[PDB]
Amino acid sequence: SLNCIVAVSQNMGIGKNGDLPWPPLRNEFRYFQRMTTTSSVEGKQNLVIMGKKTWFSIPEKNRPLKGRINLVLSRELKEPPQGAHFLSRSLDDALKLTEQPELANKVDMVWIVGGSSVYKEAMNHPGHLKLFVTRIMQDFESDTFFPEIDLEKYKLLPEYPGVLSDVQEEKGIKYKFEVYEKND
Ligand SMILES: NC(=O)c1ccc[n+]([C@@H]2O[C@H](COP(=O)([O-])OP(=O)(O)OC[C@H]3O[C@@H](n4cnc5c(N)ncnc54)[C@H](OP(=O)(O)O)[C@@H]3O)[C@@H](O)[C@H]2O)c1
Ligand SMILES: Nc1nc(=O)c2nc(CNc3ccc(C(=O)N[C@@H](CCC(=O)O)C(=O)O)cc3)cnc2[nH]1
Numbered sequence: 001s002l003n004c005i006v007a008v009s010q011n012m013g014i015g016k017n018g019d020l021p022w023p024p025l026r027n028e029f030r031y032f033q034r035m036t037t038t039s040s041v042e043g044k045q046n047l048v049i050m051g052k053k054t055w056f057s058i059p060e061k062n063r064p065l066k067g068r069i070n071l072v073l074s075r076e077l078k079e080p081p082q083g084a085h086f087l088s089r090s091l092d093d094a095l096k097l098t099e100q101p102e103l104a105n106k107v108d109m110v111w112i113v114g115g116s117s118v119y120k121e122a123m124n125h126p127g128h129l130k131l132f133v134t135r136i137m138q139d140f141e142s143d144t145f146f147p148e149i150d151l152e153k154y155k156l157l158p159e160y161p162g163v164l165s166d167v168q169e170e171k172g173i174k175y176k177f178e179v180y181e182k183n184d
Helices: 026-037 052-057 091-098 116-124
Strands: 002-008 013-015 045-051 068-073 086-088 107-112 128-136 168-170 173-183
Touching: 002 013, 002 026, 002 116, 026 045, 026 107, 026 128, 026 168, 045 052, 045 091, 045 116, 052 068, 068 091, 086 091, 091 107, 091 116, 107 116, 116 128
Parallel strands: 002 107, 002 128, 045 068, 045 107, 068 086
Antiparallel strands: 128 173, 168 173
8 A cells, every 4th residue: 555654733744944943853754754654565675756855854863764775856956965875756657566476476555755856746546545744732833845635535544553542741742643545
């Protein structure tokens, strides 16, 4: 299945000057690490698809995201950024690549991890799509925003395996984990 994962502020912001609009939330990042890294199929890895700015928004010491196959999207870059496993010129080229048997046999989940335009194209992609959305319950100054969630297609699930639905809090900031789903 194809999955998006994101943390959004109340104003639906996701980035500010190539970083997150809020201070580091240690447990929310752990959640991101766990969901993207954990495969539900023994012996297979997970694969993350991300835009170019998101890739460089990750501290160099954490690149590539360990335990996961990192794929970057770019139309300008000649070579893949140092540390990336794959480069693709479009979202669909990347998805077509994950379906190649040499990959599919080693890959379980595909995770879209940003940025904005990558989120938008994926959420309108036809098929089975899940959105793992962390609702940060506080407005934050942002220059990049998450696109609209169409509630005529996406349904908020009341629970999901491995996700705590209770309100969380770190550094004084409250947030909750949500999961939306659509089929075709
Ligand atoms: N809160 C969160 O969950 C979250 C998640 C991710 C990112 N962020 C934040 O969001 C910001 C980055 O997001 P962003 O939307 O500004 O940038 P982005 O979408 O990560 O990257 C934009 C660039 O990626 C390439 N690209 C994107 N979509 C493509 C496509 N379909 N095909 C080919 N290339 C494609 C292009 O590079 P070229 O110009 O080379 O073609 C484009 O200029 C940062 O501040 C980051 O910290 C937040
Ligand atoms: N829910 C969610 N939260 C985020 O913070 C998030 N961030 C991005 C993009 N930004 C980043 C920035 C840093 C790292 C990072 O350093 N990841 C490491 C360490 C996590 C940790 O232990 O804090 C990793 O292995 O996940 C990941 C994504 C994309 N989707 C997200 N989705």
